[PDB]
Paper text:
ChRmine is a bacteriorhodopsin-like cation channelrhodopsin (BCCR) more closely related to ion pump rhodopsins than other channelrhodopsins. ChRmine displays unique properties favorable for optogenetics including high light sensitivity, a broad, red-shifted activation spectrum, cation selectivity, and large photocurrents, while its slow closing kinetics impedes some applications. ChRmine is a homotrimer with a central pore between subunits, unlike all other channelrhodopsins of known structure which are homodimers. The general topology of each ChRmine subunit is typical of rhodopsins, with an extracellular N-terminal region (amino acids 2–26), seven transmembrane helices (TM1-7, amino acids 27–270), intracellular and extracellular linkers (ICL1-3 and ECL1-3), a cytoplasmic C-terminal region.
We observed two populations of ChRmine particles distinguished by nanodisc diameter. Particles with small and large diameter nanodiscs were processed separately and generated reconstructions to 2.7 Å and 3.1 Å resolution, respectively. The cytoplasmic C-terminal 19 amino acids are not visible in the cryo-EM map, likely due to disorder. Both maps display clear density for one retinal and multiple lipids per subunit, while the higher resolution map from small diameter ChRmine nanodiscs showed additional density for nineteen ordered water molecules per subunit. However, the intracellular central cavity is nonpolar and packed with lipids that preclude ion passage. Consistent with the nonpolar environment (and analogous to ion pump rhodopsin trimers), we observe strong tube-shaped features in this region that are well fit by three complete and tightly packed DOPE lipid molecules. Association of lipid acyl chains results in constrictions less than 1 Å in radius, effectively sealing the pore. We conclude the central pore is unlikely to serve as a conduction pathway in ChRmine.
Residue numbers in the entry:
A (entry chain A), B (entry chain C), C (entry chain B): 2 to 285
Write the structure that this text describes.
Amino acid sequence: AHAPGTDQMFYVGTMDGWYLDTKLNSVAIGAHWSCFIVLTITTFYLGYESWTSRGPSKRTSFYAGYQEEQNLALFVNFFAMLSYFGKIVADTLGHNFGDVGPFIIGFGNYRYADYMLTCPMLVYDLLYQLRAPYRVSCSAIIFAILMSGVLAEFYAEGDPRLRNGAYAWYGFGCFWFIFAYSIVMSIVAKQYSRLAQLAQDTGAEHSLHVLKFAVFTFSMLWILFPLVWAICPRGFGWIDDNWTEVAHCVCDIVAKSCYGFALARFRKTYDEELFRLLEQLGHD
Amino acid sequence: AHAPGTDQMFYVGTMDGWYLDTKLNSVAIGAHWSCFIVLTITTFYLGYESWTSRGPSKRTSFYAGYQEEQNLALFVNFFAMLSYFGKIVADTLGHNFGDVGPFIIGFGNYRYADYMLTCPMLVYDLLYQLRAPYRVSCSAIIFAILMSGVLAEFYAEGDPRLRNGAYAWYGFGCFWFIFAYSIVMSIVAKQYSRLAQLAQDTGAEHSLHVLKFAVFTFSMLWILFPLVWAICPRGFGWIDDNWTEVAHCVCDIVAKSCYGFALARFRKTYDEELFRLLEQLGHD
Amino acid sequence: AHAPGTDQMFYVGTMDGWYLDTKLNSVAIGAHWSCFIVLTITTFYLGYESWTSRGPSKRTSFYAGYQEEQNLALFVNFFAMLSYFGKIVADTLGHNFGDVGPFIIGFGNYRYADYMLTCPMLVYDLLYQLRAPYRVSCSAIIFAILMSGVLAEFYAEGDPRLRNGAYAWYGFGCFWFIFAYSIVMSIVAKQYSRLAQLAQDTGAEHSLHVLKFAVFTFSMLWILFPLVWAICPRGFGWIDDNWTEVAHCVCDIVAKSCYGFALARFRKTYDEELFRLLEQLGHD
Ligand SMILES: CCCCCCCC/C=C/CCCCCCCC(=O)OC[C@H](COP(=O)(O)OCCN)OC(=O)CCCCCCC/C=C/CCCCCCCC
Ligand SMILES: CCCCCCCC/C=C/CCCCCCCC(=O)OC[C@H](COP(=O)(O)OCCN)OC(=O)CCCCCCC/C=C/CCCCCCCC
Ligand SMILES: CCCCCCCC/C=C/CCCCCCCC(=O)OC[C@H](COP(=O)(O)OCCN)OC(=O)CCCCCCC/C=C/CCCCCCCC
Ligand SMILES: *C/C=C(C)/C=C/C=C(C)/C=C/C1=C(C)CCCC1(C)C
Ligand SMILES: *C/C=C(C)/C=C/C=C(C)/C=C/C1=C(C)CCCC1(C)C
Ligand SMILES: *C/C=C(C)/C=C/C=C(C)/C=C/C1=C(C)CCCC1(C)C
């Protein structure tokens, strides 16, 4: 696209940039391949667990089939895998893939477009494991945050005269994210405290460690994406391009693969009375 | 974009128009600022009410947290605020924002793209207050109507040879809107009549006035948007550009801020028996 | 859009192609008109049935109003009609409509963009009639399949150097589709077998034929779209353009109009005990 006052051509958000040669080196391609392989493996494992998923009483034939919330995390991984497959194709075809082409929600040819479909699922699943209140609201807040990030990317990659708008959108996102983060942490802490005071002088003591570790670590590890934005060329620029791709791949692996594996481990050790305690949690 | 048979350049739906200088005067900018401020204030107030929301029995700790339908209206305002924030940034950066750039659902850089995410929420919330039937169906109809409006905008702002298609889409939308409007009015009337015959010789007589006023006024006041389309330059052209922005800001304020404030007022006076009557309404 | 190394201009995904003259002959226009008329008729009939829809006990006033799953199929037809109306306008205005213009989910100006909104509804409705498990999961799989098809279309209609990516995406879609197809067939078979062993020595024997025919035929007839893709110019090229439009119109008619009519016929003959059997089906 052309801009007034200059002859420079800007390829962001246009089909012209879709046909440009790729700007990535071998490191980014290797990171994309590794993330795709890991996501495929985790998707297959979660699908296998969902198929052979007896209930907490180990009596229901298809427990995840009738109560599909247990499949929610699986969905994330599956869609995440899709969001990487296209990337892989790009590195095989040698054409540009960064912030060019059509805007499709759930497809990661834009920086935060793929997260806009899976992040609410992640927040809902994390809050649902403790039967916490304010599940859909946090998902809506996260959806708005990712929309703000997408607009920040559009403003950052465009005409220089409209560069400060990127910072403005980033600030908006950060403000609301801080609010949501604090709320989520408080809610999680309260819920876990109640669970700890419900399981006193009672078994299932080992599974509580796994649940606590998973929920707390994978709720606190969401600060990585704003820090990456701060250090990427859109911010300070401490790490150049082709290294923010590796950082995003590592963040996606930690946020999705490890979280799904932790939930799979937790669902393999809990039993009826802990399920009843979890049900009692969401009653007050 | 270029068009056959002419050298004229059309900037609708392109990234070229995203970098163009703004066409708005100070009045439209002031209207955008006022609407953003009002939406921010209402979002904060609704969030505060949702946090300190005891149930109708005034016993539940987090009533809106576990039954999140009460938060629905809040969501609208929040997203509406987002849809204006970007607009604000545009007026600060001095670049064009009308029907240019990427197409993101829920972002108001296109005329009716932002309404496509919040209008079904508004219809569902309005029909849910009376426990009325046909809630999701009306939301789907409204979603289709806003899609028709978006396509009408695309046809209107494009090549002149394809201008009549705008009118065609407008007609489609109007037809279905008339159908939905009649259906909604009938349903609301019937439900309120039943409520009036359920609360006879019973208290809670003051809150019925507030509920009736809110539901009836904010269901009838949806005719304003087709009239604005009729009088805007896309239709007759009685009011020029930079004044349809003020009209849309006023319509958004009335449809969202006042509706949320009215529901907040209603939820502050009703009690257990009116809640039981509302539950009895959705049983037949 | 321009591509490096050549002066050829590619109109896919651009606003430039929106203003180009139409490439369709009279046969494609007639097929579009026939499909639009059929979808309009079925939408009106399904709306009439939904309005005058007594329950299985023939006692509830608005059965579909309070339990809106019965309206789900109707929604499909309605949206399908919208997806054709715009097409009709294009043939009246004489401008290009194939894979050009804005990308709107649910609007069929791209090949598989309209199916991405109605196909999950179709899968959920088909699996819900037997109270089968894994309803939302199959809908998500189908949504991913249609996204893969859309990306395949983008790669196929673009620069020749990036043509093999179309095949790659097609393969991805086919793989996952095969998985989903097998799963769906197995589930349906098991559910129907249980229903057959629940209605033994019991009436409602005529409605079982209609249910079996509808579910089995309209689950098996989903293989037509991959075969059309295989034989269309994007694949082997056995049938040229302007004949894949007729094939897609016929496939849409069979998949939506006939399915809705079959469900309407089935809902006109079943009664209380078959409803209780259907409820018993989803319990194990
Ligand atoms: C603006 C965007 C905000 C996004 C906020 C939402 C974030 C995502 C929320 C995910 C919600 C859960 C998705 C899966 C639904 C599964 C629910 C379910 O199976 O149970 C519900 C219910 C109760 O069954 P039980 O009694 O447990 O059965 C036991 C008897 N054998 O049964 C049903 O399945 C009824 C259907 C309810 C769900 C209907 C489908 C809703 C789908 C919504 C979209 C989900 C994806 C959201 C993606 C967002 C991308 C922007
Ligand atoms: C083609 C688009 C058509 C759009 C049609 C839909 C319009 C919007 C409809 C909004 C539906 C309501 C959204 C909020 C869901 C909250 C429901 C809820 O909290 O209760 C449901 C249920 C029952 O709980 P109770 O028994 O009341 O709890 C008491 C025990 N302590 O609990 C649950 O939350 C289960 C989850 C159900 C909801 C799952 C999430 C669904 C989200 C769908 C998308 C919503 C946004 C739609 C935006 C549309 C934009 C195009
Ligand atoms: C990533 C995309 C994956 C898509 C997966 C989802 C595929 C579509 C699933 C469709 C789910 C059903 C849609 C219609 C919801 C209607 C449910 C309903 O009416 O009952 C639910 C419930 C129970 O009522 P009963 O007790 O039966 O009432 C009897 C008392 N008189 O009541 C409610 O309506 C509560 C609200 C629940 C539904 C909330 C709305 C959810 C809308 C989700 C989006 C649907 C469209 C999806 C389009 C997908 C396009 C990508
Ligand atoms: C699997 C992916 C996950 C969990 C992604 C999470 C992403 C965020 C929490 C992103 C946050 C952002 C901001 C707070 C500010 C603006 C930009 C973002 C998108 C990096
Ligand atoms: C907060 C915003 C609200 C409630 C918006 C409501 C908008 C409408 C009812 C719009 C209707 C339209 C038509 C009936 C015809 C075609 C164009 C529209 C979009 C103006
Ligand atoms: C009403 C429309 C319906 C039921 C459409 C169904 C479409 C499919 C099952 C399409 C499948 C595809 C693949 C399996 C591979 C890639 C391309 C598609 C989109 C043709």
